[PDB]
């Protein structure tokens, strides 16, 4: 009777953005990303790709509490790279890798049959 709605697990409310930025003053060139309507599926995927980047000093995310479709990540790209650019870099990298595997799977399904 107090249980939250299921359909909101993916619906982003209008007033809030899908993502929220916050610089981390405690250390240089470190930001904080507040997440909404996302879970390990995107979190770990982005985190691993970024962690493979050399120009990143720190990066780590955690879900504050399972009941809420929102988590946080603390990125710190080294001086040259501001965190946001490495983030979009990881986005594009995963995009291209996924498209590569997609075309590969298309080919393999086509040939196998």
């Amino acid at each position: 009777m107090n249980a939250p709605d299921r359909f909101e697990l993916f619906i982003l409310p209008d007033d809030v953005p899908k993502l929220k930025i916050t610089p981390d003053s405690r250390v240089p060139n470190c930001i904080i990303i507040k997440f909404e309507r996302e879970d390990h599926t995107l979190a770990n995927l982005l985190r691993e790709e970024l962690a493979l980047y050399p120009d990143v000093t720190f990066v780590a995310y955690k879900v504050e509490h399972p009941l809420f479709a929102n988590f946080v990540m603390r990125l710190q790209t080294e001086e040259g790279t501001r965190p946001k650019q490495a983030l979009e870099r990881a986005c594009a990298s995963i995009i291209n890798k996924l498209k590569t595997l997609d075309h590969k799977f298309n080919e393999e399904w086509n040939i196998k049959n």
Partner: peptide, 11 residues
Amino acid sequence: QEKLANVLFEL
């Protein structure tokens, strides 16, 4: 892919 594209669009 669409989720990632949307995420970068928000970026």
